[PDB]
Amino acid sequence: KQFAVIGLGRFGGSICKELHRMGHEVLAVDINEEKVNAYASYATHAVIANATEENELLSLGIRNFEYVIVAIGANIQASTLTTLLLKELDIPNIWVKAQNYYHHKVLEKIGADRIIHPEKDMGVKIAQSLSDENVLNYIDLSDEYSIVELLATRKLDSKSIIDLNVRAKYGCTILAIKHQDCLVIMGHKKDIKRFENEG
């Protein structure tokens, strides 16, 4: 697979370094000369180009890339003009980083295959950890069930699994323990909060 990442910011620069670490052909495009020089070593091909121009986009052979990631999320004009061109060039998969709710609505009309909010998805994830310090990481299977990696408190010390009645009393299934030790649990959103309060 060949990937193109347009815009080497904090978000796009992470995708170039990660996909290059896994051993993939990454094209790194950025309008900034100093950004491309820094990520020149972290990409298979790095070009100092403006992606809002169709002539520059055809010069890169952008039609040969199955996945194009437009990591521009502070310039709505540059981001929407780029993903309109890539939809014109018949790119199978265009993934765009959005800025606000209105930028999400423009890109949904002009044909973005997946629209990503990196700071909004992390900020909600961080604020869940701020509100309840017991949690460390979670994944939402649905809107009401989650796999919350809880942190064992002082009252859970020296307590066996059979002593815990999470299976029946709370209806929560413990998955793993990482030796205060990390306690991975699964259950309803309201049911897990009962186990956090009562230990």
Annotated binding site for NAD(+): 10, 30-32, 50-51, 72-74, 97-99, 103, 119
Instruction: Decide if residue 31 touches ligand ATP (CB under 6 A).
Output: yes
Instruction: Decide if residue 134 touches a copy of itself (CB under 8 A).
Output: no
Q: Interface with a copy of itself by CB under 8 A: which range of 57-65, 150-158, 180-188?
A: 180-188
- DSSP codes, the chain: -EEEEE--STTHHHHHHHHHHTT-EEEEE-S-HHHHHHSSTTSSEEE---TT-HHHHHHTTGGG-SEEEE---S-HHHHHHHHHHHHHTT-SEEEEE--SHHHHHHHHHTT-SEEE-HHHHHHHHHHHHHH-TTEEE--BSSSSEEEEEEE--STTTT--TTT--TTTTS--EEEEEE---EEEEEEEHHHHHHHHHH-
Numbered residues of the known binding site = 10, 30-32, 50-51, 72-74, 97-99, 103, 119
Out of 14, 164, 174, 193, the only residue in the binding site for a copy of itself (CB under 8 A) is 14
Instruction: Name the site residues for a copy of itself (rule: CB under 8 A).
Output: 1, 3, 9-15, 18-19, 22, 24, 52, 54, 67, 69, 71, 73, 75-77, 80-81, 84-85, 88, 95, 99-100, 102, 105-106, 109-111, 116-124, 126-128, 130-131, 137-142, 144-145, 147, 149, 173, 175-176, 178, 182, 184, 186-187
Instruction: Point out which residues bind ligand ATP (CB under 6 A).
Output: 6-12, 29-32, 35, 50-52, 71-75, 78, 119
